């Protein structure tokens, strides 16, 4: 019954920030999506580039049969660059959706949720907030970027009710000058669940400040090959079980903070 793989149709694609493209994909893979924080394994349209590109699902629309991703491209030798040349109407070779996502079932209206995102870790957090808004809970969402030049999804997050949104930039070009971690240190309440995704140094800061929190969900990245747990490319050490390897693609990409070392 599950589709596993599909030549999806790119509905649109446009550069929404410096070297960051938003692509809308239409297919039957959208009907299988559930938890935020799953990903798609994308084949580059270049036959010399055989490894699929792992990209977070940013949002979806089950009625529209569409999902949305936001991805940063490299230089003209990169595969993501090739993907960005695909035009409205083209097909793209997708495997997915894949991985353990962010759990939301046990979130309830009483809880106060904190969300910490950075860089290209931000896209999957949008579908997360979108789902938490239905549970009538109150969220604070802190997002940091290198520059105004790479800020993404501010408007989408702002249009969400029950959301306080603060935005930092390392250079100060927009919002608060500095890194997200600073806005974390200013938190003045008891958070019951924290969801975070972004660059390793940021994930590390979040994991120390809330090391004692149990509902602490961290979305990881890694170099990948098979994307399904067979090849062992993407292993993290299991913190709670030394002598055991976690696989980012299949055990994750989202882990409990107690499962991870820094």
């Amino acid at each position: 019954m599950p589709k596993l793989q599909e030549m999806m149709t790119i509905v649109s694609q446009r550069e929404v920030a410096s070297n960051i493209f938003e692509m809308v994909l239409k297919g039957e893979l959208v009907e299988e999506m559930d938890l935020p924080g799953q990903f798609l394994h994308l084949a580059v349209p270049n036959a010399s580039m055989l490894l699929r590109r792992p990209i977070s699902i940013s949002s979806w629309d089950k009625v529209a049969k569409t999902c949305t991703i936001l991805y940063r491209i490299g230089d003209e030798t990169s595969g993501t660059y090739e993907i960005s040349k695909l035009q409205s109407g083209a097909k793209i070779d997708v495997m997915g959706p894949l991985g353990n996502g962010f759990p939301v079932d046990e979130v309830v209206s009483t809880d106060k949720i904190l969300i910490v995102g950075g860089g290209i870790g931000v896209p999957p957090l949008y579908e997360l907030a979108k789902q938490l808004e239905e549970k009538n809970c109150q969220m604070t969402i802190l997002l940091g970027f290198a520059s105004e030049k790479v800020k993404i999804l501010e408007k989408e997050f702002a249009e969400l009710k029950n959301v306080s949104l603060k935005i930092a930039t390392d250079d100060g070009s927009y919002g608060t000058k500095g890194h997200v971690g600073m806005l974390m240190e200013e938190i003045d309440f008891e958070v019951d669940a924290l969801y975070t995704c972004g660059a390793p140094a940021m994930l590390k800061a979040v994991a120390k400040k809330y090391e004692q929190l149990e509902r602490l969900y961290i979305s990881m990245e890694s170099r990948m090959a098979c994307g399904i747990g067979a090849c062992y490319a993407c292993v993290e050490h299991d913190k709670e079980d030394e002598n055991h390897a976690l696989k980012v693609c299949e055990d994750g990409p989202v882990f409990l903070g107690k499962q991870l070392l820094l």
Binding site: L50, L51, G79, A230, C231, Y232, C234, H237
Partner: protein
């Protein structure tokens, strides 16, 4: 049928075999199709003790290929005898399994070869001799014919199943090693394992792989694989399972023209999880296109080519 092929320890419904280290122990790819379609499976390497393997990053992309340096991560003999192999026996009792066997020293290789044949679904041991030898200065058991022949003969003494040897392409002359290993009692060969490659990150100016070097696989290495398979086939009479860059039924047949009797498929599974069943089903159409009645005949015609 036309696709059926018989090898020492292997009565295969077709010659398509996922290569070791690219299929795990089947549990993940089974989610995508019935593994009974396969002829066999080369499961991840088994070492005597568990291995976490090398640090990350472990993989990198290359032109028509990839680099990999997992470092033979595996749960070790006991767990593989108790969990991995039995799961394959329960869910696919008729699917013959090739157990890839690796090690750091000869005693370790021998110990695994003594035990792993006990598993009922294991029909062949694939001896991986591309491993660094800590009794020989880190020398890959497969670059020296005398070392290799000794290892083979020792493992041959304890195997309850036919023993195949997986040859490494990283040698000046593969013919002495192949001859010596057949003389030591090898029932068959598989070739090739990976080439060695390196990528550098332009920003950090350091290697992409934590291990610095990695194994180079994929279609990029098929011409080298065909060269070495062809070279070895003129020099031994035991059969060869060919692999390296195979992606299509065309590639399978090209392996046969080189002298292989069955074909393993590795890196292609990562780009296309269905590649092995897709190849299996397009083999008869493609054999028609080039006037080949059966794979068994083709093997004998090529063997007499010679």
């Amino acid at each position: 049928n036309r696709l059926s092929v018989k090898l020492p320890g292997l009565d295969l419904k077709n010659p398509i075999i996922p290569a070791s280290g690219c299929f795990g122990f089947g549990e993940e790819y089974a989610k995508y199709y019935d593994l009974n379609k396969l002829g066999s499976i080369m499961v991840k390497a088994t070492t005597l003790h568990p291995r976490f393997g090398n640090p990350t990053p472990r993989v990198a992309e290359t032109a028509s290929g990839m680099l990999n340096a997992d470092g033979l991560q595996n749960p070790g003999l006991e767990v593989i005898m108790a969990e991995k192999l039995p799961w394959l026996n329960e869910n696919f009792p008729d699917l013959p399994i090739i157990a890839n066997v690796a090690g750091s020293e000869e005693d370790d290789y021998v110990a695994v070869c003594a035990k792993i044949g006990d598993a009922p679904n294991v029909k062949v041991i694939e001896l991986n001799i591309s491993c660094p030898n800590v009794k020989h200065g880190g020398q890959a058991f497969g670059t020296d014919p005398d070392v290799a022949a000794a290892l083979v003969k020792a493992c041959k003494a304890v195997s309850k199943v036919p023993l195949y040897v997986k040859l490494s392409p990283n040698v000046t002359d593969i013919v002495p090693i192949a001859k010596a290993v057949e003389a030591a009692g090898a029932d068959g060969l598989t070739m090739i394992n990976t080439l060695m490659g390196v990528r550098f990150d332009l920003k950090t100016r350091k290697p992409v792989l934590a291990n610095i070097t990695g194994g180079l696989s994929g279609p990029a290495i098929k011409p080298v694989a065909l060269k070495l398979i062809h070279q070895v086939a003129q020099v031994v009479d035991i059969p060869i399972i060919g692999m390296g860059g195979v992606e299509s039924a065309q590639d399978v047949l090209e392996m046969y023209m080189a002298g292989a009797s069955a074909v393993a498929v590795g890196t292609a599974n990562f780009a296309d999880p269905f590649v092995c069943p897709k190849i299996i089903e397009k083999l008869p159409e493609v054999m028609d296109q080039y006037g080949i009645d059966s794979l068994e005949n083709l093997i004998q015609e090529v063997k007499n080519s010679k």
